[PDB]
Design a protein around this ligand. Structure first.
Ligand code: HEM
Ligand SMILES: [Zn+2]
Ligand SMILES: [Zn+2]
Ligand SMILES: [Zn+2]
Ligand SMILES: [Zn+2]
Ligand SMILES: [Zn+2]
Ligand SMILES: [Zn+2]
Ligand SMILES: [Zn+2]
Ligand SMILES: [Zn+2]
Ligand SMILES: [Zn+2]
Length: 179
């Protein structure tokens, strides 16, 4: 079942409000045709170069960053091209990316783990893993939100992305860490 870690700063926040805030502050890195710049808005894999247990990306607007964890593969130019696929077990959100091939966030705000998301290569860019991560890269947490909402309801059908982190802690899903 999904497990969430949150800084006590966010106890009274809803998951949706947190995600919409973080995504707006991270912004859109403009990873799209004609706009990809190696070393600026590609992010990186650990161990990489195009596969690993982590994919991490820093904002180009702010100090926000995220780390996706699991078993992740990027097809680059191979068919189906520009597809991230594999198993997505976790998403960590916060600021100030450190490390590398592991990555960590200096300020880890919220992490969602045991996501259990998996997308085979055959689904291409329509895979859930691709859509969740590419959404974050593009300033849009909607895909992530939809997956979190379904996972929460699978544990306890009255929970949702409009639950506060404290409500999720009372339901046994979330765990606070010191600010
Ligand atoms: C090491 C990391 C990455 C590198 C070096 C990389 C490189 C590139 C390059 C060079 C392009 C431009 C290709 C073109 O438009 O012809 C591109 C486009 C794209 N990338 Fe990435 N990328 C990386 C990570 C990712 C990740 C993690 C995702 C998804 C979660 C992704 C999704 C896309 C998408 C959807 C496009 C547009 C594809 C198209 O329109 O043909 N990329 N990438
Ligand atoms: Zn955009
Ligand atoms: Zn192209
Ligand atoms: Zn694999
Ligand atoms: Zn493998
Ligand atoms: Zn922050
Ligand atoms: Zn599957
Ligand atoms: Zn219930
Ligand atoms: Zn109930
Ligand atoms: Zn706990």
């Amino acid at each position: 079942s999904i497990s969430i870690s949150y800084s006590t700063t966010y106890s009274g926040w809803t998951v949706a409000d947190y995600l919409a805030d973080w995504s707006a502050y991270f912004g859109d890195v403009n990873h799209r045709p004609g706009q990809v710049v190696d070393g600026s808005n590609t992010g990186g894999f650990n161990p990489g170069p195009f596969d690993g247990s982590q994919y991490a990306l820093k904002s180009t607007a702010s100090d926000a960053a995220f780390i996706a964890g699991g078993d992740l593969h990027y097809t680059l130019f191979s068919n189906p091209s520009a597809t991230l696929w594999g198993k997505l077990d976790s998403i960590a959100l916060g600021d100030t990316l450190t490390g590398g091939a592991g990555y960590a966030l200096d300020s880890q705000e919220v992490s969602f783990s045991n996501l259990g998301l998996d997308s085979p290569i055959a689904q291409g860019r329509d895979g859930t893993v691709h859509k969740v991560v590419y959404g974050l890269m593009s300033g849009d947490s909607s895909a992530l939100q939809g997956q979190i909402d379904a996972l929460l309801k699978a544990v306890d059908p009255s929970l949702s992305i409009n639950s506060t982190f404290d409500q999720l802690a009372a339901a046994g899903v979330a765990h606070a860490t010191p600010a």
